[PDB]
Paper text:
Intracellular ADPR targets and activates the nonselective, calcium-permeable [name] channel in the presence of Ca2+. Belonging to the transient receptor potential melastatin family (TRPM), [name] shares a characteristic MHR1-4 domain, a transmembrane domain (TMD), and a coiled-coil domain with the other family members. It is unique due to owning a characteristic C-terminal NUDT9-H domain, which has been considered a classic binding site for ADPR and its derivatives, but the presence of the ADPR binding site has not been directly observed. In summary, our human [name] structures defined two distinctive ADPR binding sites, one in the MHR1/2 domain and one in the NUDT9-H domain.
In the EDTA-hsTRPM2 structure, the NUDT9-H domain is clamped between cognate and adjacent MHR1/2 domains, forming both intra- and intersubunit interfaces, while only the intrasubunit interface exists in the EDTA-drTRPM2 structure. As a consequence, the NUDT9-H domain forms a compact structure interacting with the adjacent MHR1/2 domain in hsTRPM2, whereas it hangs freely in the drTRPM2 on the bottom of the protein. In the absence of ADPR, their interface is made of extensive interactions between the core region of NUDT9-H and MHR1. Accordingly, we call the interface between MHR1/2 and NUDT9-H a resting interface in the apo state and an activation interface in the ADPR-bound state. The EDTA-hsTRPM2 and the 8-Br-cADPR/Ca2+-hsTRPM2 structures were nearly identical, and they clearly represented an apo-resting state and an antagonist-bound inhibited closed state, respectively. By comparing the distances between the Cα of adjacent pore-restricting residues—N1049 and Q1053—with those in drTRPM2, all four showed an occluded pore, including the ADPR/Ca2+-hsTRPM2 structure. Lastly, the hsTRPM2 has a well-defined NUDT9-H domain that has two major interfaces with the rest of protein, one with the cognate MHR1/2 and the other with the adjacent MHR1/2 domain.
Numbering used by the authors:
A (entry chain D): 1128 to 1165
B (entry chain A): 1053 to 1098, 1105 to 1165
C (entry chain A): 524 to 581, 614 to 976
D (entry chain D): 902 to 980, 1020 to 1052
E (entry chain C): 977 to 980, 1020 to 1052
The structure:
Amino acid sequence: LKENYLQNRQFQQKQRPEQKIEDISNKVDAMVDLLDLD
Amino acid sequence: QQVQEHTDQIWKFQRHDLIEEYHGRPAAPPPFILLSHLQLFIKRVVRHKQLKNKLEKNEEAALLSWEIYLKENYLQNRQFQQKQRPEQKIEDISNKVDAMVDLLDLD
Amino acid sequence: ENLDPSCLFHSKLQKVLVEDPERPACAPAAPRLQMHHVAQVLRELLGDFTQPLYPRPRHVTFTMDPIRDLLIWAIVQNRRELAGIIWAQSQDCIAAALACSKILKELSKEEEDTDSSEEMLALAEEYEHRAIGVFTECYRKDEERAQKLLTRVSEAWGKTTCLQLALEAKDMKFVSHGGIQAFLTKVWWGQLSVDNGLWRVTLCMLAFPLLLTGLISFREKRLQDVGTPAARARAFFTAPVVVFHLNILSYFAFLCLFAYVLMVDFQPVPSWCECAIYLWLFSLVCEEMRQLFYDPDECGLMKKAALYFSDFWNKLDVGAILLFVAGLTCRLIPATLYPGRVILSLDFILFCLRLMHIFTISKTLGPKIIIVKRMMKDVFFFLFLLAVWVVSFGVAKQAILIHNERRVDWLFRGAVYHSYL
Amino acid sequence: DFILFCLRLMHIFTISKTLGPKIIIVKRMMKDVFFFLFLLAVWVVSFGVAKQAILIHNERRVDWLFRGAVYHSYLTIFGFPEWLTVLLLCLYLLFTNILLLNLLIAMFNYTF
Amino acid sequence: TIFGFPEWLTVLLLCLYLLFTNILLLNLLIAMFNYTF
């Protein structure tokens, strides 16, 4: 049951909107570097 | 319900002069005070270092440098916390995509 | 010399420049801007208690600490982004932020233009927030070291302390920080430790040698451990909590003796107890007079008297003094004994209302006093309407159930008793 | 001692579901109830000795006039003479029947 | 009473009644009735 609780807690902490914006901001930097390097 | 929320701030502001008056008052009860009065009149005939005092310069320099260092640390913390507001993060994200727009349109 | 000519400070500087005598004494066609003119107009804004920042004179050269001069120049034109840069490299930042808040809060009151006034007031509040944010960071590291910042004398800002600037500028959020409250409490308990409680203080107030026992607190343990009981008694009696308690006990005994003299000992020939309460009230007004003539800063004597007479409890005190000096000369005329008795009775009520001043020093009772001081204003106006309603129904009741009768104090006082019931 | 043992019976309602928090609330409210009682007491004894002083001469009666004024003041606390009596009664109706009840409304609503 | 050297004793009994009855249970009613309202 501890294992199941940890799964649920991690999945719910993924769905916060602030974390979603942070992941979206981190993802665009790879595109910036890939477009600038070539 | 109109004034009960913040009048404690006014009381905390009003505390100080009541402290300072009794700090400055001579220590006798009002019957026996008069001799102290005329004792003061002898000082009239011929501040305190607790609320106001001049420090020594070798100590004051250390104090001021300590304050400088703590100001620097505060400014670091304030700038870092103002970076993490979500509105500023959205604004930075919006500014970053325009460079990609221009780079994709120019080539 | 190159301020923008739309700001208020430029107009005030022009006024003090043309009002100077020595420049038209030199040449009326040539007004010359000198630095002590700027110091003179800054002394008006910053408060009379400070010193002139730039002294009157009687290769290159720096003044002491130029960054405060650049900060003062950038503030009075309301340039926000420049002042935010310049303050970041200042030397003693807390006094600087408080002085900038005081200057802007003073300047925003007489501008007569709305948008710039609101901008100035918001900027002053922002600098108060900067001062709080630096001080709490200083307070987190050390306790007793950070108290010394509130009480040193900074020569850079006209030889004032950092606390008077916060007190004058009405910076309500800074004074209620909590570290400042701890400092005020530490001053309030004085020499001994702050945690012994009130009832223990009352018992050692009652018993002299109980202080020589091991039932009391102290701090700075060279006085606690090494017992020099004369010095311990002097340190105990020097603390202002003890002086407050002895003063309130003397005032209580004064009230009880005044009630005893007013009850039975009233007599047209002067009794000795009348002379006792006379010299007691003389001592009280002597201390009150001494409190007015104290001012170490060369401030306004009329300003000091206007500050004293604007106070509520001081107004009640001088009202009681006026009623006492009226009742005493009414008593000394032997044909007016009973008017003297009733005037001294009302004076006793006015002196006994003074005892409500105690609970302001309490932690949880002061705000209640502020609340009832607010509530009095519409209590009075409600009392007016209830009075006119009750006298209306009273005269209606007397009119309907009785014939026309010209009884002076029979039927009118009977209806008054019925309406009061 | 019987009164002190009968106060012990208030310990019952702590086991109740909806009554225990009320016991905690009144255990909080006692602290400023006491300090309000002090100020009302000094106000009432002030107006009592004022009333006894104005409307009577100097009399050294031990339990006649003092207990008569005490009964008059307790009766007031339980709740050309026209102008003077109207002034005294309207002063009492001004001060007692309004302000301290407003202070209690404020303080008790606050701590509740 | 529910509808509402003897000096010290009568003053003590009357001030005990004025302490307990006229204050505390009305504060409990203020708290409880304001709560359930």
